[PDB]
Design a protein around this ligand. Sequence first.
Ligand code: LDA
Ligand code: PR
Length: 387
Amino acid sequence: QALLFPLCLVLYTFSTYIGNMMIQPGMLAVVEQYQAGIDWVPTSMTAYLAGGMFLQWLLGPLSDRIGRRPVMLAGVVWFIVTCLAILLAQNIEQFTLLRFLQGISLCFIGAVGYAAIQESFEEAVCIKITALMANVELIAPLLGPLVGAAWIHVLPWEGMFVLFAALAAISFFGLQRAMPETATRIGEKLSLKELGRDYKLVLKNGRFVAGALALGFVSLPLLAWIAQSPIIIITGEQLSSYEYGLLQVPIFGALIAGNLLLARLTSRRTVRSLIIMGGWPIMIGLLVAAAATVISSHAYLWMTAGLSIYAFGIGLANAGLVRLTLFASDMSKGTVSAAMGMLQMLIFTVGIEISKHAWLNGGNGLFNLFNLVNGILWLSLMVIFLK
Ligand SMILES: CCCCCCCCCCCC[N+](C)(C)[O-]
Ligand SMILES: [Pr+3]
C-alpha cells in the first residue's frame, strides 16, 4: 500500500545519477558557451563528486539527531533549487560552485535516504528495494549518456536541468505529503567530537582502510573514463553523439553482464574466491586497455574493448569486496559506509584530476597507464587483503 514511498527515493536516486550521466556528454556544449577549455569537461564530475564527500560523514548521525524527514527534504529542496539556479550563473568560474553544491545532494541518498529504509522497512522488504536501487546505480549511468546525447540534438543542454528539477519534484510532491520519519536520536546534544574520534577508529583499521581504498582505486578507471569519455571521443577522437554513445554500451553492457553472473554465482562460490575470480579480467582489462595505446595512440576501439574486460570484472569482484570491507571492521554500519564513502570519493575526485592531466600532456597512453596504475594499486592491496 505504501510502496509508493520507496519509488520516490528510487526516483531521487535515479535523477542524481543521470544528473551527472547525461551532463558529462553535454558538458562540451556548456564549455563551448561558458569558454574555458575542454579540460573543464571532467572537472564537472569532479566538483559533483567532491560535494558528496563533504557532509557524507556528518549527515548520517545528523539525520539521526533531528529527524529523517526534514533533513531529507532539505536535500530534495536543495537539489531542485540548484537544478535551476545554475541556469542563472552563466560563467564557468561559478558554474563549479553550483555544480559542487549539486554534489552535496549525494550524502542525502545514503546517510538518510537509504537509512530510512533500513529503519522502517523490514529485511525481505529491504532486499527487493536495494536490489532495485542497485539497478538505478547501473541503468542511470548506462542509458543516461544515451538520452544525454539525444537531448543535445533535438534541444539545448538547458532542457536537462529543468527536466531534473521537475523529476526531483515528481518525487518531491510525492514526498511532500508521503514521507513518515523514524529517527530516534531526537533531542540529542551537538556532539561533534564523538564523530571524528570514532571515524579515526575505523581509520586505524589497516585491513579496512587498505580495503576501502582498494575499492576506490579499482572503480576509478571506470569513473575516470565517464568524466573524460566525451573529450576522449568527441573532441579527442572526433566522433559523433551516436558513435561516442555507442561506445558507452559495450563497456556498461559488460558491467551489467558481470552483475548478472555475480548474483548467480554468489551461491556456488565463496565471496573470497569471487574477488580473485573477477580480478583476472580486471587485470587483463587495464592490462590491454593501455597495452593497446602503447605505440598506437588512437585505437580507441581496443581501449573501449579493454574497458569492457575491466568492466565485466568490476561487476563481480568490486561488488563482492564491498561487504567484506564493511565487515573488515567490526564496527557500526553508518560509520563504516561513511568512512568508505569519504575514502572512495577522495580516490575518485582527486583521481580524476590526476586522470585529466594524464590525458592532456600524455594523450591516451599516459591516461590508460594512469589506469593500470589503479589495477596495480588494487591488486597490491589484495596480496595484503586475503593472502
Ligand atoms: C558514484 C558512482 C556510483 C555508480 C557506479 C556503480 C559501481 C559501484 C560503485 C560502488 C560505490 C557506489 N556508492 C554510491 C554505493 O557508494
Ligand atoms: Pr559513537
